[PDB]
Symmetry: C6
Subunit: 94 residues, 6 copies
Amino acid sequence: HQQEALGMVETKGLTAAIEAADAMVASANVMLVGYEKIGGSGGLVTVIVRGDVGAVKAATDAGAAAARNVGEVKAVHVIPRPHTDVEKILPKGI
Amino acid sequence: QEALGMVETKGLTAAIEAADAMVASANVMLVGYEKIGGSGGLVTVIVRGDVGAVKAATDAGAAAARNVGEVKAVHVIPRPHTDVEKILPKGIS
Amino acid sequence: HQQEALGMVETKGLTAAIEAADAMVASANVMLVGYEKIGGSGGLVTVIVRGDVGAVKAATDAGAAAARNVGEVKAVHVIPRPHTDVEKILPKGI
Amino acid sequence: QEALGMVETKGLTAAIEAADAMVASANVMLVGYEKIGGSGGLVTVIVRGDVGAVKAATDAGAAAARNVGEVKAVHVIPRPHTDVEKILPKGIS
Amino acid sequence: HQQEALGMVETKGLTAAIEAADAMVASANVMLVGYEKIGGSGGLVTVIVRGDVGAVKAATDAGAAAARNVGEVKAVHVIPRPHTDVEKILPKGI
Amino acid sequence: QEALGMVETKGLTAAIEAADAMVASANVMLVGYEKIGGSGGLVTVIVRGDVGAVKAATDAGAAAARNVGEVKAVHVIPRPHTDVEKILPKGIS
């Protein structure tokens, strides 16, 4: 029994975000939560994933490595969230 | 009525880390995110609760956010002059 | 019997706009009309208030003074509008 | 049919001052605002009415707006080639 | 029997786009398809027209000439599209 | 299942030229446009179909777009790891 976790890769543009998502779901047993468009200078897209801490750490590292060859990665981060309400922290539209 | 706390960051990733850090105490409620945009790609995380709880939560959120991204604003309104529903903007989640 | 008036404080970001709103409703007997997000480089939020010319002049001066300690104030303005249709001039979504 | 007048400003505050100034004559009708964004945070105020009324209103709107903010564009289309509803964009208020 | 065509004039701001549209519909027997707001630094508005290749070439040249006296024209382009499904290529919201 | 192709441009005009060029072969399907914004005014054209068809279409789209505007990104995902519906964002047309 592990701890749940939230993983993010924030890129300039959608193309790099789709490559980060595909790379993330391919590298670990992580579930793709969804994309979040924030736009504003750079046109930022955030790819969010969930799963075991180790899986999410490996997936975000993989997704960022992939996305960097397509576009610019602005942020890469892992939140090891609790057991219950792992997506309570996310924004409503996902 | 209740105190209002805000952390405004450049990007969503830093805003989600600020939110997780802020809700980490049982007496602080996540009101929601508000996307503004501009050069930063500004996201505002709003919380409510007791003055002390909100002061500690926003200080925690900003501390966390900063290690992920850039914090543009951090503020606490201990006694909002109108009902927190009146003072806040229409779309908030 | 006075003249009705419209007051605005336009800031970079929402946090400074919420502080301007709270400061405005605290300083004078002015009603908070609402916020308007315009985004685009700076991420501009406009706080609109209504009431007596004097009240609105005092409130916008107060709101701008407050908002400047939280963020950047881009514009501060008072329109002394007519008796009838004081919000006819505003944009629909408020 | 009727003439079309536009004042495009950097920001909403300057656009509201332009609109108030433009509608200040009984023969000029406020079509609406259109938010565009970009580096300016562009807002377009559109009016309609008689050529003379619209020429005087847009010149008044731009004169006013300029003292509040930056005016990016001012223009009058005296005889729009299609119906004003056809020439304008779908969402206008 | 000619070939159908799609014409575009992309400007910084709406005012220049409305002048480009009015100029386009005045210069040739072209139908105004609609506007597309893309925003992001410059606040780009695209005016799309359809009709005969020659008509669309003359209209876009006219619309761009007009729009340049009101604002900044970012792009001017003509696509001579097929006979069937001339608007299949366009984005849904127009 | 099917390969996924993307061309991301600064502006819509270059994106429409990329799309027209990409669909110019019967075995390539236009998924849709996605507007992102930022300094570029980014528009992403997404296509699907056979690997070879998608490789040739995105190379064609980028070749075309570039003569109209600026191409920010060009990429092909030959074997998307989840269903193409899962990997793509919710609003796509």
